[PDB]
Each structure stands twice: as structure tokens, then as C-alpha cells.
Amino acid sequence: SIYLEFVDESYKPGKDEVIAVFRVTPAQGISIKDAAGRIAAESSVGTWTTLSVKPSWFEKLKAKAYRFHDLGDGSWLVWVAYPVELFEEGSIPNFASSILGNIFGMKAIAGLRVEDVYFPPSYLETFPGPNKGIQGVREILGIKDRPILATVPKPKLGYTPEEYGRVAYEILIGGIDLVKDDENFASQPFCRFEARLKEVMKAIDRAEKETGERKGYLANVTAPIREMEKRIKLVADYGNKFIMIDFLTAGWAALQHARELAEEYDLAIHGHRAFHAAFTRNPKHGVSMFLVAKLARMAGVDHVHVGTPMDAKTREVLEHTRIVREQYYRPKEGDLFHLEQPWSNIKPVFPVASGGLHPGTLPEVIRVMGKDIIMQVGGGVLGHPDGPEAGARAVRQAVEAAMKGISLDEYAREHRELARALEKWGYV
Amino acid sequence: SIYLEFVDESYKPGKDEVIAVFRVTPAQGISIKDAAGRIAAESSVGTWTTLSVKPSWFEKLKAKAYRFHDLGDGSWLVWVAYPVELFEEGSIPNFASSILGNIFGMKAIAGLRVEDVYFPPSYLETFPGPNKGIQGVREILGIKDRPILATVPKPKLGYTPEEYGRVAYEILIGGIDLVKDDENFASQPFCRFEARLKEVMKAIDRAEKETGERKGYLANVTAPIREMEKRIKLVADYGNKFIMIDFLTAGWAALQHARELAEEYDLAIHGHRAFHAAFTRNPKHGVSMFLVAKLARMAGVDHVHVGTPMDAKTREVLEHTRIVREQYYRPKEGDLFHLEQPWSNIKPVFPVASGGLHPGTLPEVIRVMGKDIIMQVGGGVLGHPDGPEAGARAVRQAVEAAMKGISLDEYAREHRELARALEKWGYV
Ligand SMILES: [Ca+2]
Ligand SMILES: [Ca+2]
Incomplete structure (x- = not known):
């Protein structure tokens, strides 16, 4: 009362x-x-x-x-x-x-x-919003139009620095743009951050020199603040342009601090949303992933995962991509669960798509989510019958067919690596 | 498979x-x-x-x-x-x-x-665990045995620095030990952190000089990392011994960083758990508050709220107090929801009790939760018919009756301030 x-x-x-x-x-x-x-x-x-x-x-x-x-x-x-x-x-x-x-x-x-x-x-x-945004990341990689591709090694843990560095080489050498640490990689004793970063940055330098294509490493700097600060500087000193941070497990203040160091060191930030599903799943209690994505864009990630993509959850994945990429978000008529939001002075964010993506599925994701995405294509790459190099080439040819408007069946006749991707996994 | x-x-x-x-x-x-x-x-x-x-x-x-x-x-x-x-x-x-x-x-x-x-x-x-623990906080305040008392002003926001400082004076002058910022107080323009801290630290100095009793301020340093660092140093430079941090909204890395600065500056930390109920309420999904409290003790809060106290939720509040205070936690026989946990080299934490506590209710909380608690007694203090000074005295007399093993009805006959507390709110 x-x-x-x-x-x-x-x-x-x-x-x-x-x-x-x-x-x-x-x-x-x-x-x-x-x-x-x-x-x-x-x-x-x-x-x-x-x-x-x-x-x-x-x-x-x-x-x-x-x-x-x-x-x-x-x-x-x-x-x-x-x-x-x-x-x-x-x-x-x-x-x-x-x-x-x-x-x-x-x-x-x-x-x-x-x-x-x-x-x-x-x-x-x-x-501040994103330091780089979609356009700044495209310019870092020299990738004008197509979706950008990323791969996390399998298994996600268990490699020494030497071993991790050879795994990354094969990934990049065949066409993947970004090698990505998994969310729980930090600086454990079996593979410390600095020794791991050296081995991957040597792998990147080889792959750029042989392919002619820029490559990057989404290095996980998730850590107590003083350790994160050192790791962000080591990433910068090695000429890498990206850091990754688990912004819900390190926390919002850590993310905003990483955003200030990214300003200083001219880096982009991949925000990993691990822990979000403890509170974004229940439609009756918690925080919508939509709002978590909006706060991540304000705080300054350059990339963020929007969840997996017609039904209600696909509709909402589409609203997630709209709220992180658009300059002026407007809810559709009659949608009361979202509000209108101009984004004056806040750069757009790269949505990240993931979830068992194989070459066969990639064109449909690109048609539905647009070309301005990062696709994580781990299984499709590391599981290719001819090895990961060929696996990365299959994904790139699959993306090439989508950019060129060519049916996959037609493309997969003068393109060997892709041919077996469609053989093995089909259109899942 | x-x-x-x-x-x-x-x-x-x-x-x-x-x-x-x-x-x-x-x-x-x-x-x-x-x-x-x-x-x-x-x-x-x-x-x-x-x-x-x-x-x-x-x-x-x-x-x-x-x-x-x-x-x-x-x-x-x-x-x-x-x-x-x-x-x-x-x-x-x-x-x-x-x-x-x-x-x-x-x-x-x-x-x-x-x-x-x-x-x-x-x-x-x-x-590291707590910097000070129960015993170090008791030594800071010079409070050997009784529960420690804390009050958040009402309303929680709306005071200028000058106004906030007079409110704190009345609270401390009558017997409350700690004045506490609310969780959403930070450094908004209407009451910036530094100007607010000066006004409260002058109020503390008066109250210590008049009462003979040490007092402290749980100053909310929740902020982006660089702003928190400055605020923790300002707290330290003004001779205050406490900081408060919203460790789930600033994040775990912020809390661990605050714990390192507390080491440097010889401070205790009050951990505020705002946001926890987005994921600790659903018994089928999320994180138990028990585990959040255990991680807070590891990361290094000296005080933490355990939730409100025979039934299932009271049983669990009692398990929360046990896991943050004990040196060797053992689940009761047949309890499969908790694990045995020795705490070698990790100091105990002060549980904080709160929830509409009035003088009449205080003895029962102390008998059930023990003397090693902080009670937040806002309504009981600021709502006393004779003003907050008398309100703090009523709470202290109520605590005095509990320490002395005297019935409240009997104590409330040679003790005026308490008498009206029992009149007004009774045994709620
Ligand atoms: Ca991700
Ligand atoms: Ca509290």
C-alpha cells in the first residue's frame, strides 16, 4: 500500500x-x-x-x-x-x-x-560499445563479404603447447580464419597461456605466409584481473588482434576492463557467454538472452554467440541477431517482449553461429542469418575424411557456393573436398 | 555412446x-x-x-x-x-x-x-579466503562476543552527501556498529562516492569520540575496475576498514581483485549477493546458494548474506551458516545434497542475517544462528517511535538481554527505548 x-x-x-x-x-x-x-x-x-x-x-x-x-x-x-x-x-x-x-x-x-x-x-x-565491430574485424582479416569461419580444436583440452600449435596449423592452412580456444582454456599447468600463445602465433605466421590470407587467434584471457591484464598485453605484443573473455564467469567489470585494454592495444573482443543458461532458459524467471546480448554490445564485445537457428526459438535467434547488428532496432508489430532501441554511436556486433554445422548446412544458415556472421565449424572441419586441411577447404567451398548462388550438388562436382563432405554428412 | x-x-x-x-x-x-x-x-x-x-x-x-x-x-x-x-x-x-x-x-x-x-x-x-574473517572483523570493531549490528538508511537512495552524513550520524550515535550502503549505491551524480565518503567518515569520527566505540562504513565500491581501484584506495586513505562489493554484478574477477587490494590496504570485504536469485531459486536448475557462499568464502569475502531463517528453508539457512563459518564442514547423515569440506587455511566468514528484524525477534535469531553473525536491523532502528538514536539503543538492549540470558519482558522494564520497541512491533 x-x-x-x-x-x-x-x-x-x-x-x-x-x-x-x-x-x-x-x-x-x-x-x-x-x-x-x-x-x-x-x-x-x-x-x-x-x-x-x-x-x-x-x-x-x-x-x-x-x-x-x-x-x-x-x-x-x-x-x-x-x-x-x-x-x-x-x-x-x-x-x-x-x-x-x-x-x-x-x-x-x-x-x-x-x-x-x-x-x-x-x-x-x-x-563504448565494440572497439572494432563487424567492419573493423572484417578489415583486420581482409574478408570483405563472406561469413568468417572459426574452429575450436577437438578435444577442447589435453594438448601441450607444442601439440596445440600443430593442431592450429592444419586448421588455418586449409581455409579457416580464426582458431578459437574453448571457454575453459585459461592457463592451466599442462598448457600455460604464454607457451600456448607462442606455439599458435608461429602456426598463424606460417599459414598467412603460405595462403596469403590473414588469420587470427581467439585467445582466452579469462583470468583474475592482474593475470588477464598480462595476457592481453602478451596477445598484443605477439601481433595478434583478438582476445576472448568469458564475460559472465569473469564478470561484467572484467569485460569492461578488457574493453579499455582493447582500446589501448587496438584489439577486438570475442565474448563467450558460458554460464548464461543458468538464468536465460526459464521463460518465467531470469534474464532473456536478448538483454544479455544487448548489454554485451554496450560493454564492448565485437562478437557474441546468439544461439542456434520456422518456430519460436528460431524467431528469437533472429531477434538476437537483429539487436546486436542493427543500428536501429524496432520490434515487429504486436511484439511486447522487446522495446525499440536506437544504437547511435555503438558499432554492430558479429553474431556467432554454432551447433554441429557441416558444409551441407552452411548455405541455409547464411541465407537465414545473413552474411555478417561468424560460423563455428569445428565438427565439419576436424572430422573430414581427408583430414582437417581438406575439411577447412570443404567448408570454404560450401561458403563459396552460397556466395555465388550455386546449388551445393552442382558445386560439389568440380570440388573434391566438399564432395566428400556432402557424401559424409549430407544436408543435416 | x-x-x-x-x-x-x-x-x-x-x-x-x-x-x-x-x-x-x-x-x-x-x-x-x-x-x-x-x-x-x-x-x-x-x-x-x-x-x-x-x-x-x-x-x-x-x-x-x-x-x-x-x-x-x-x-x-x-x-x-x-x-x-x-x-x-x-x-x-x-x-x-x-x-x-x-x-x-x-x-x-x-x-x-x-x-x-x-x-x-x-x-x-x-x-586466499577472507583477509580478516570473523576474528579480524571483531578485532577491528573491538566487539568481543555479541553479534555485530548494521543498518542501511531509508530510503536507500535520494540523499545528497550532506544529507546522507547526518543520517549516518544518528544511526551510529545510538549503538549501531556499521552503516551500510545499499547494493545499488555506487557513484551516481547526485551523491558521488568521494563526497559521500567524506560526509560519512566525519559522522563516524564524531560517533566514535562520543560513544567510545569503534564504528565502520560498508562503502559500496561496485564499479568498473579502474573506478573500483580508486574507491578502495579512497576508503583506505580515510581510515575506514571496510569495502562492500556486489560480487555477482561486478563479477568474480572483480571480487578477487578487490581481495588483493584488501590485502594491500588491510581491509575487510562485505560481499553483497545481488543477482543470485536469478539462478539460485529453482531447485531443478541453476546453482545452490550454498555453493555460491562457499565460492564467496574462497574468493575472500569477510561477510556474506546467508538468507532468511523448523522447515526446509530454515534447515538450509543453517547449512549456509555452517559452510561459511566452520573449519570442517560435514553433512548430516543421509544428506546427499552437500559434501564434506575441510577449510584448512581459509578463515571463517560472518553470516549476515536480515529480513525485517525488530528488537523483539533478535534473541531468537541469535539463539538459532549463533552469536557470530551480523544482523541488519534497518526497520527496527529507523522506525523507532523516538527516533533512530533510541532505535539503535533498543536493538542494543535487545541484544544485551540475549547475551545476559534475560527474558525480553523482564529486561524491558528498566530499559525505556526497548520498552517501546516491544510495544510497537512485539515478537514478529
Ligand atoms: Ca562463442
Ligand atoms: Ca548483504
């Missing part, structure tokens, strides 16, 4: 307020209006009973639930408007402590999903 | 392997053994089809599901043993990328909850 003060369905936020859309399942006995005012109060200025010193900014900073949509299943969409003065400039941690913070554990709530957040220009521009 | 290679119910891990216990709900059509081998493979060395360079460490690094317990509801407990060479020394991010990483989003899994992880001594000792 003190919480009615935070609800106002006659309010109209301007374009200059932060807007959150929540999917709210009130606990038993709690009305949606009650739950919504508690969410608005807890994620902004709290409450007071008696005032022993005036807070001159309380009514100014207060958030308002101004709009309700009954989903007919026990949950509601609630829009909450937030004054921008609630948030510290350029700080993802402070944003998350408000809108992604205690509200998830309140007793009045049986489920709370944060679906999307609209950031106004004055707040959005306090964040 | 390649995944049978990671299951072995005849295996007996030594005391020197990391052990995880997962609650696994296989997807439709997937057997538990299949799901369990996929979890073990994905959280360790992955798989391979053909080998183009030998991984000399694959079979050595491989994790094994060695034990199954059917919960009779569609989910199983699965124990997985992990060689310690999988993990980078002292790195919570690398640990999380393995055991808290991609396994949550695998298609074979309909739910995956990480219930607990046993850390062997050789791995556990690569982490």
Missing part, C-alpha cells in the same frame, strides 16, 4: 528515461499492482516510514510501473520507467545491481524475468 | 580430486547415464572423433561420473570427479567456466542444478 505510490498507469515516459519490461508472476495472494510497485521501489529508491533527514532526490529518482499486460497464464508484462539519474555513467555493474539485483529474490514474486531494457541516448552513449 | 566413456560407477575418487554433485533432469528420451557422460565431457576435455595430433593429457584430464542417486521425481543426483589439473590455480572464473559453464545449456539437459563442489586441499589452498 506504500507500494501503490510507485504505480501510475496514466504515466507516459519520455524518450529520455530507462524503460524495463519484466515478466512478473506474483506470489500467491499478491496482486500484480502490488508486485509491480514492489519491483519499482526495490529497483530504485526503496521506501521510507519516517524521515529524519530530507532526501532531496527521492521523488526525482523514483521508478514508476506505468503499464500492464496480462499474458493469461498467471504472469504479466510490466513496464517500469526509471530516471537516468539512478544509474552511474558507463557502469554495467551498477545497472545490474538495480534492474538485475534484489528484485529476483523478493517474497512477493514467484517469478521475475527481465525481458528487455530500453536505454536512452544520454545513458547509452556513456558506454 | 562416445559418452559412456565418461561414466564409471566402480570408480572411487581419492581425497585429491574435485567432486561436483549435480541434480540432473535429462531431456525427453535421454537416459541419465547419457546425460551424465555429456555433463562430464562438456565440463572437462570434450570429445574427439579422429586425432590429427596426440593430446598427451586427454585421458589424464578427463572427468568421470561415478555415482547416481534417483530422486524419484525425474531428476537424479550425479557425482562427477574432476582431476585438479583441469583448473587454473586461484581462478574462480576458470572454475566457473568448467563446472558452471556450457553444461547448463546443453540440449540433452532439461534441468541442471549444481548443488555442491568438494575442493581438495591442494586446490583449495590456491585461494
Whole structure:
């Protein structure tokens, strides 16, 4: 009832307020209006009973639930408007402590999903966004139009530095553009970061000299802050242009710090989203992957995985790619789960596609997700009957057929490596 | 079927392997053994089809599901043993990328909850643990035996530095030991960190000089890394002994970095767990708060909130307090959801109790949770009919009755401030 003060369905936020859309399942006995005012109060200025010193900014900073949509299943969409003065400039941690913070554990709530957040220009521009973006990564690699290709070794762990370096050579030499560490590679004793990086950067130099094509390494710098700082400088000192960071397990502050060092050292960042599915799977509680991707783009990844691609989940993968690549995102008519979002001064991000992609499947992914993607094509490459070099060539020929508008069956007659890819795995 | 290679119910891990216990709900059509081998493979060395360079460490690094317990509801407990060479020394991010990483989003899994992880001594000792612990915080405050008391201002936001400083004075002057920022206080423009800290540290100096009692400020340094570093030094330069960090919204690497600066500057750390309920609420998917508390103690908080306290949730709050305070945690007989854990070389943590605590309720919380706690007693203090000074005195008298073994009704006859606390709120 003190919480009615935070609800106002006659309010109209301007374009200059932060807007959150929540999917709210009130606990038993709690009305949606009650739950919504508690969410608005807890994620902004709290409450007071008696005032022993005036807070001159309380009514100014207060958030308002101004709009309700009954989903007919026990949950509601609630829009909450937030004054921008609630948030510290350029700080993802402070944003998350408000809108992604205690509200998830309140007793009045049986489920709370944060679906999307609209950031106004004055707040959005306090964040750097990607250092390089799609166009800067294409320029690093010299790849004008086609999708870029990446491969993680198999197995993901178990190689000494010497062994890992020979594995990378075969991958790059046949046409893959980026060799990628897996998410749990860091600097374990069996393969320390520096000794591993030397062996891969020697493999890159050979492959560039023989192919004529630039190559890069998505080196995993996930680490406590001081160790990450050293590893980012070692990557830079070896002439590599990319770092990878597990931004949910190292954390948002680590990602924003890596983004500052990327500025200093002229690097691109691959953001790995490991841990996201602990809280992005349940449609009734947690954070949508859509919003995690939007925050990753603000914080400054240049690449981010959007999940796997007609049905509801494919529709949402398509919304993920739109929110990370577009300069002006607009929800389709009647879609209440996302908000309109201009991205003035924030470069687009490369969506990463992955999930058992073989040469046969690549044209359809490119037609559906567009050419501005990174495809991770591990199984298709390392599992080719003629070895990984031929495997990377098959993927490149498959991509070539898609760029040239040629049927795969037709292309796979003057192209040996691809021919056996279609033989072995077909159109999966 | 390649995944049978990671299951072995005849295996007996030594005391020197990391052990995880997962609650696994296989997807439709997937057997538990299949799901369990996929979890073990994905959280360790992955798989391979053909080998183009030998991984000399694959079979050595491989994790094994060695034990199954059917919960009779569609989910199983699965124990997985992990060689310690999988993990980078002292790195919570690398640990999380393995055991808290991609396994949550695998298609074979309909739910995956990480219930607990046993850390062997050789791995556990690569982490610093608390800088101060219970005993070091008691020595900072000069509080030998009783619970320590903390208060967050109301409202949690809206005060200028000048206004916030007068609010803190009244809190400390009447007997509260620690004034605490709320989780979303950082350095917003209406109340910047430095100007706020000056006003509170002047309030502390007055209160210590008038009461004779040491006081402290849990200053929220949650921020991008460079801003946090400056704020931790400003806290230290002003002679304050505490920092607070939202360790899930700033992230694990930020917490471990704050722990190194606390070493340098001789500070204690209050860890705020905002965001945890996005993934610790669902018993079928996510991470138990028990394990989050264990990782917080390893990473080095000195205080951590354990959630609110006979039934199942109270039992678990009691297990939370045991895992953060004990030197040798042992599950009760037949409890399969937790593992035995020695804490050699890791100081105990102060559990924090909170949740509408009034003077009437305090003795029961102290009898149930023990004297080695921090109680957050905001409403009881700021809402006292005679003002917050009297409110802090009522809480202290209530604590005094509990230490002295005196009934509250009896104590509240020669103690005015408390008398009205029992009048107003009673025994809630
Ligand atoms: Ca990825
Ligand atoms: Ca707390």
C-alpha cells in the first residue's frame, strides 16, 4: 500500500528515461499492482516510514510501473520507467545491481524475468560499445563479404603447447580464419597461456605466409584481473588482434576492463557467454538472452554467440541477431517482449553461429542469418575424411557456393573436398 | 555412446580430486547415464572423433561420473570427479567456466542444478579466503562476543552527501556498529562516492569520540575496475576498514581483485549477493546458494548474506551458516545434497542475517544462528517511535538481554527505548 505510490498507469515516459519490461508472476495472494510497485521501489529508491533527514532526490529518482499486460497464464508484462539519474555513467555493474539485483529474490514474486531494457541516448552513449565491430574485424582479416569461419580444436583440452600449435596449423592452412580456444582454456599447468600463445602465433605466421590470407587467434584471457591484464598485453605484443573473455564467469567489470585494454592495444573482443543458461532458459524467471546480448554490445564485445537457428526459438535467434547488428532496432508489430532501441554511436556486433554445422548446412544458415556472421565449424572441419586441411577447404567451398548462388550438388562436382563432405554428412 | 566413456560407477575418487554433485533432469528420451557422460565431457576435455595430433593429457584430464542417486521425481543426483589439473590455480572464473559453464545449456539437459563442489586441499589452498574473517572483523570493531549490528538508511537512495552524513550520524550515535550502503549505491551524480565518503567518515569520527566505540562504513565500491581501484584506495586513505562489493554484478574477477587490494590496504570485504536469485531459486536448475557462499568464502569475502531463517528453508539457512563459518564442514547423515569440506587455511566468514528484524525477534535469531553473525536491523532502528538514536539503543538492549540470558519482558522494564520497541512491533 506504500507500494501503490510507485504505480501510475496514466504515466507516459519520455524518450529520455530507462524503460524495463519484466515478466512478473506474483506470489500467491499478491496482486500484480502490488508486485509491480514492489519491483519499482526495490529497483530504485526503496521506501521510507519516517524521515529524519530530507532526501532531496527521492521523488526525482523514483521508478514508476506505468503499464500492464496480462499474458493469461498467471504472469504479466510490466513496464517500469526509471530516471537516468539512478544509474552511474558507463557502469554495467551498477545497472545490474538495480534492474538485475534484489528484485529476483523478493517474497512477493514467484517469478521475475527481465525481458528487455530500453536505454536512452544520454545513458547509452556513456558506454563504448565494440572497439572494432563487424567492419573493423572484417578489415583486420581482409574478408570483405563472406561469413568468417572459426574452429575450436577437438578435444577442447589435453594438448601441450607444442601439440596445440600443430593442431592450429592444419586448421588455418586449409581455409579457416580464426582458431578459437574453448571457454575453459585459461592457463592451466599442462598448457600455460604464454607457451600456448607462442606455439599458435608461429602456426598463424606460417599459414598467412603460405595462403596469403590473414588469420587470427581467439585467445582466452579469462583470468583474475592482474593475470588477464598480462595476457592481453602478451596477445598484443605477439601481433595478434583478438582476445576472448568469458564475460559472465569473469564478470561484467572484467569485460569492461578488457574493453579499455582493447582500446589501448587496438584489439577486438570475442565474448563467450558460458554460464548464461543458468538464468536465460526459464521463460518465467531470469534474464532473456536478448538483454544479455544487448548489454554485451554496450560493454564492448565485437562478437557474441546468439544461439542456434520456422518456430519460436528460431524467431528469437533472429531477434538476437537483429539487436546486436542493427543500428536501429524496432520490434515487429504486436511484439511486447522487446522495446525499440536506437544504437547511435555503438558499432554492430558479429553474431556467432554454432551447433554441429557441416558444409551441407552452411548455405541455409547464411541465407537465414545473413552474411555478417561468424560460423563455428569445428565438427565439419576436424572430422573430414581427408583430414582437417581438406575439411577447412570443404567448408570454404560450401561458403563459396552460397556466395555465388550455386546449388551445393552442382558445386560439389568440380570440388573434391566438399564432395566428400556432402557424401559424409549430407544436408543435416 | 562416445559418452559412456565418461561414466564409471566402480570408480572411487581419492581425497585429491574435485567432486561436483549435480541434480540432473535429462531431456525427453535421454537416459541419465547419457546425460551424465555429456555433463562430464562438456565440463572437462570434450570429445574427439579422429586425432590429427596426440593430446598427451586427454585421458589424464578427463572427468568421470561415478555415482547416481534417483530422486524419484525425474531428476537424479550425479557425482562427477574432476582431476585438479583441469583448473587454473586461484581462478574462480576458470572454475566457473568448467563446472558452471556450457553444461547448463546443453540440449540433452532439461534441468541442471549444481548443488555442491568438494575442493581438495591442494586446490583449495590456491585461494586466499577472507583477509580478516570473523576474528579480524571483531578485532577491528573491538566487539568481543555479541553479534555485530548494521543498518542501511531509508530510503536507500535520494540523499545528497550532506544529507546522507547526518543520517549516518544518528544511526551510529545510538549503538549501531556499521552503516551500510545499499547494493545499488555506487557513484551516481547526485551523491558521488568521494563526497559521500567524506560526509560519512566525519559522522563516524564524531560517533566514535562520543560513544567510545569503534564504528565502520560498508562503502559500496561496485564499479568498473579502474573506478573500483580508486574507491578502495579512497576508503583506505580515510581510515575506514571496510569495502562492500556486489560480487555477482561486478563479477568474480572483480571480487578477487578487490581481495588483493584488501590485502594491500588491510581491509575487510562485505560481499553483497545481488543477482543470485536469478539462478539460485529453482531447485531443478541453476546453482545452490550454498555453493555460491562457499565460492564467496574462497574468493575472500569477510561477510556474506546467508538468507532468511523448523522447515526446509530454515534447515538450509543453517547449512549456509555452517559452510561459511566452520573449519570442517560435514553433512548430516543421509544428506546427499552437500559434501564434506575441510577449510584448512581459509578463515571463517560472518553470516549476515536480515529480513525485517525488530528488537523483539533478535534473541531468537541469535539463539538459532549463533552469536557470530551480523544482523541488519534497518526497520527496527529507523522506525523507532523516538527516533533512530533510541532505535539503535533498543536493538542494543535487545541484544544485551540475549547475551545476559534475560527474558525480553523482564529486561524491558528498566530499559525505556526497548520498552517501546516491544510495544510497537512485539515478537514478529
Ligand atoms: Ca562463442
Ligand atoms: Ca548483504
